[PDB]
């Protein structure tokens, strides 16, 4: 009954959404960090026993 | 698809009591079984892949108009998901449940003369898997106790050792045995492995995969009943209760 | 009396009786629509230098995402369509496509499965029989245009009767030299070059004077109800692709040079009305098969 | 022994070896795309009672505004397309279009220029040779549907050998009367009206009885890789226009009644694979030539 | 006239139809991957001076930690792999392993059970038939390199026909002395030591002169699609290990010297394409078995 | 690679004056020039692709020891980028530049008996594009004016009308013609995908096209390292030993 109008004209430069593009790109940096961290722990700490 | 999703003796037997016999039969003419055919499997080969049609595929096939054909269609529906083409059976028989046909004398069908050797041979048992064999042995056990042929059922199992090893343990007249049984009878379900949208060479495997991918779509659709979310919306008659038992058991 | 007949009208093999219900015809209709979009997306991808339009169209068609090192063959929809096409062609072809698969693919798009919205004109000329007296020679050649060569060796003029069946709507006869043709128990008019005949009129008698041979070129047009999406050019290409791909190699079947001859031959048989309905569905399926194969090719 | 050969398979002339690289292929694909837009723009201009859609399309195609007094020819793109068509047909054509002109014309639109992402079916029937014994007459007529008329005048039945080449996919034979055909060193089946054969199977022997002549009608289908924009209806019409316009009027060349016969004849020459790729490019060029000339007659 | 055939090509027994679907194929791929880690854990143990790497590898393979009072067997996956191999060899073998157990074991590692992403070369030479006339002795010995001994005690030269099937891709023939060989209805060339031929071409005629015996050695190469993890050396060792352990001991089946003979013999059956897919999956299972049993003898 | 990028008559003539004959010749045997061969093009066909070898492919081939062989090697270098294998040419000829071999009398080579029609047939002028034919005619005209056989050049042009249309419009003696020439003779240039072409000539030409962008930047430092302390070979001073076999 009280639907709010949503506009994103200022967010779009032509057909490109800058904020969404930069935010998605940060997952590539996180992916590199995850792989580097897992490999370092496996090298420093070998097979683990409890 | 619904019948193939049952994973326990309780659920499978409960489903057979609810469903009528018309689900077991099909009104599509299909083709004939035991025929050598060349099918097209282009994802793997350019030529035509040979195979043999059987009664265990999930496609409707023409069936004989006798009691032998009716029982083969019921077991085919349980172990494959589709039945055969036996028309003009009669509305009196088609209204009754699959369980009632299998284990009640009131229906009027006479199944005493049925031999388990040819039925297993015709419903090709060398091509079944472990889950399919268990369901067939359930149907044989239900029929045997209907006509008082328990001794014949035991001798048949003793002749075939592998069938005896996987034979479900339950007495058709007792509900405590169904509750205690812990066999896994599910042919379709949510897969732990990676299920892809690819074809399989055999007719049986391709049809089985179609049911498996179909169950995943149905599992995530709106027709599925999520008990953890809407258990208070089901009616009281069909709600899960431990006191619940099959009629006459 | 000697008898001659068209080669393509001899012994029409039976057609399939499966996947002819409402759901199956809906599935074939959906397959044609999605195959057409697959061809268009491949063009849009090429003029745009981006694989996005093609990937999206293939994802709708195959319910899977394309991946390198895996050959794009169309997925489960292509497998079902190919085996269904075989079943339509002959009654010896197996039915190996489960009903749950047909229903699942039919729901992928919302199109009507009605196969009788429109019509189409088919050009095969049916010559059921040509009967000639003892001292005459008759030869029939062709299906799109039939050339009937008649030679009279005896002294007197001969009478040759032509039967064109009851299915074709019009038949036009043109002769190398002017000739006389009239219906049974009717006077023969002056020699003319052309005749327009309705095959339901009855057997037609043509006088063959002694001398040089007379050749008659026959052209016929018949109308068959087809879905509004039916395209004759695409169907013929799909018919040739299916024959070359080897999926019409079934036991005890007849082979035809075009879908035109196939549908007319089935029409000129007992229970020909029911065979034509199945053949029309196979024609639309062949249209889907052609478009899908061109979009995703093999070497 | 007598030999009978299809007329359209005799002595295929060498095709041009120019304008078949990636840049030249892109130019042909660009020309087809812009020629198609030229046709659609003319229809839009007529429907909308305005000349704006056509002026934009003609300007992109010809790099010049249309003028009422001047004639509409298509500009340099028309001349380049006309010249490459001549070069594609024969090796003796001048081939006088500069490379710089082609590169600048291929940069107008973005196309891959790939001529191997689809296929088309060509219906010409190849009959390389028909071997007949003495006292037998064999005549072959037709290229889209071949009729082989055979007459036996000897004492006994004759064996007539058919060779359909090694390229065609399937051949369907329908006779005037039922007849017998079998492969070499194979028993003959019962008389039948129809036969479906693979030309790779080998030479086929036909038993010809003494008496009335036997006519065999042949139909063949062959698959050839073509671009996705290939249209057989447009290619065949463009082929006729180019012949009428004199683009193929070169010395020491053969002539064909259709593009289907041209490509199949070049396929069956010695090392015919060398020529199929160039012939397909000519077909796409003829597609663009058709659409351009119909929009802008000259 | 006598006929001779290869011994290993006679009467292939039917193969199993279970454990072919995607889940079962992924179980075999997981078993191969995890069994490989078991072997490599030995070298890690030598370098690390401790048994911890082996304990980790066995715990993942068997779901249970190794014990010193128990003989290491492999647990559920070892039992599942053994029973699944039995089902593959014959249709008479029971399918004992449940589906649920297969899915649970298939979820241990991430793999794709694609068995059509590579190929392998199989060297078993198929001689379907060798037809010789009277007064001629022909003996076929060998399966990987077939030696055919030919003696002509007759007055004149004899013609002997070879049939190598329609499956093998190439066959190379090397004779003790130069001999003449040609296809059917072809002229014979000068005597040569070596011939390379395609079995699809047709039956081959070899001229046998009267005198000393002529021996021909046949080597063939066939391409069969196999998963990328396929290793012929490991598969061959697994075949011998399984036969020794009695996994193939079942009534009404045939016995082969190597996996090379088993797969080629099945491929030359009435419908050999149906059995090739199952045989390849048996190969991967055997490769897993050889690694698992060498690390954990029992 | 450098000779193919020249797009003007001025640049092509300047390159030939700087380049010695050594880079026009090659030291690799190669194969027989004209031969019907089957080559593998797996990007398109499973079967082997038929083709004919020639002297226009950028691959070394055997050439005889005569003036005809030397001329053919020079023209092939200009129109294709790779020369031919002429055995034991000699120091005196190798140190001379390409232009002096074509246009000067001090080289010691007689070229008065050259037949232009035979050379074009041997170089397979039919399978040449517009740019390659122009370069061949430049070399022919230079030789024609060097030996005074200007009439024979016109007779050859009259016999080949298509070549007469695209013939260069420069007179070797005059310089105003070279300055004002407007021909485009570039074969390689900065723009194409990393793909394979069917023909041997087309594939080899595309290899030069794809490698030109990389060659534009990498050749500068690698070259300068080679001749950092090396005496130039072109017109090298020597005792003028002998010219054998010519």
TrEMBL record, chain A:
Domain of life: Viruses
Protein name: Vp2
Annotated organism of origin: Banna virus (BAV)
Positions spanned in the full protein: 655 to 704 of 955
Automatic annotation (TrEMBL), chains D, E:
Stored Pfam families: Seadorna_VP8
NCBIfam families: seadorna_VP8
Official protein name in the record: VP8
UniProt organism field: Banna virus (BAV)
Phylogenetic placement of the source organism: Viruses, Riboviria, Orthornavirae, Duplornaviricota, Resentoviricetes
UniProtKB/TrEMBL annotation, chain F:
Domain of life: Viruses
InterPro entries, alphabetized: Seadorna_Vp10
Protein's name according to its UniProt entry: VP10
Organism: Banna virus (BAV)
């Amino acid at each position: 009954f009280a639907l709010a109008q949503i506009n994103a004209d200022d967010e779009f430069i032509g057909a490109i959404d800058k904020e969404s593009a930069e935010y998605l790109d940060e997952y590539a940096t996180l992916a590199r960090d995850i792989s580097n961290s897992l490999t370092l722990v496996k090298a420093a700490f070998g097979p683990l026993e409890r | 698809m619904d019948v193939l999703s049952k994973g326990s003796l309780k659920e499978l037997l409960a489903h057979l009591e609810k469903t009528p016999l018309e689900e077991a039969i099909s009104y599509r003419i299909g083709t004939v079984p035991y025929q050598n055919v060349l099918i097209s499997r282009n994802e793997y080969y350019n030529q035509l892949y040979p195979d043999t049609t059987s009664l265990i595929d999930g496609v409707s096939r023409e069936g004989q108009r006798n009691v032998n054909g009716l029982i083969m269609s019921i077991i085919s529906y349980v172990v494959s998901g589709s039945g055969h083409y036996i028309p003009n059976i009669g509305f009196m028989l088609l209204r009754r449940s699959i369980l009632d046909i299998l284990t009640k004398h009131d229906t009027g069908l006479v199944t005493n003369n049925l031999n388990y050797g040819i039925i297993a041979r015709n419903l090709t048992v060398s091509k079944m898997n472990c889950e399919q064999r268990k369901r067939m042995l359930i149907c044989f056990k239900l029929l045997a106790y209907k006509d008082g042929n328990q001794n014949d059922y035991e001798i048949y199992l003793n002749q075939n050792i592998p069938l005896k090893q996987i034979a479900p343990n339950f007495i058709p007249g007792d509900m405590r045995t169904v509750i205690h049984n812990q066999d896994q009878l599910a042919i379709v379900g949510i897969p732990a492995y990676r299920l892809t949208q690819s074809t399989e060479l055999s007719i049986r495997d391709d049809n089985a995969k179609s049911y498996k991918l179909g169950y995943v779509d149905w599992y995530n659709s709106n027709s599925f009943l999520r008990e953890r979310s809407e258990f208070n919306l089901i009616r009281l008659k069909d709600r899960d209760t431990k006191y619940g038992k099959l009629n006459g058991w | 009396a000697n008898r001659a007949t068209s080669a393509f009208l001899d012994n029409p093999h039976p057609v399939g009786v499966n996947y002819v219900d409402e759901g199956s015809r809906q599935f074939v209709a959906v397959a044609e629509l999605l195959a057409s979009k697959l061809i268009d997306s491949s063009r849009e991808s090429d003029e745009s230098n981006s694989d996005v339009p093609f990937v999206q169209a293939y994802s709708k068609f195959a319910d899977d995402n394309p991946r390198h090192l895996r050959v794009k063959t169309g997925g489960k929809m292509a497998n079902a369509l190919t085996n269904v096409i075989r079943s339509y062609y002959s009654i010896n072809a197996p039915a190996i496509v489960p009903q749950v698969e047909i229903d699942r693919l039919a729901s992928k798009a919302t199109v009507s499965g009605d196969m009788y919205n429109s019509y189409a004109i088919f050009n095969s000329v049916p010559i059921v029989e040509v009967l000639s007296p003892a001292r005459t020679t008759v030869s029939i050649v062709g299906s799109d245009r039939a050339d009937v060569t008649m030679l009279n060796t005896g002294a007197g003029a001969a009478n040759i009767t032509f039967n064109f069946g009851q299915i074709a709507e019009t038949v036009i006869l043109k002769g190398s030299v002017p000739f006389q043709l009239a219906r049974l128990n009717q006077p023969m008019p002056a020699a003319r070059f052309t005749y327009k005949l309705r095959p339901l009129d009855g057997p037609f008698i043509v006088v063959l004077p002694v001398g040089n041979p007379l050749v008659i070129s026959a052209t016929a047009a018949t109308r068959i109800q087809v879905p509004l999406a039916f395209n004759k050019a695409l169907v013929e290409s799909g018919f040739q692709t299916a024959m070359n791909d080897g999926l019409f190699d079934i036991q005890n079947v007849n082979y035809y040079s075009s879908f035109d001859e196939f549908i007319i031959s089935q029409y000129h048989a007992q229970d020909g009305i029911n065979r034509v309905s199945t053949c029309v569905i196979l024609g639309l399926a062949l249209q889907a098969y052609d478009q899908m194969r061109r979009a995703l090719p093999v070497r």
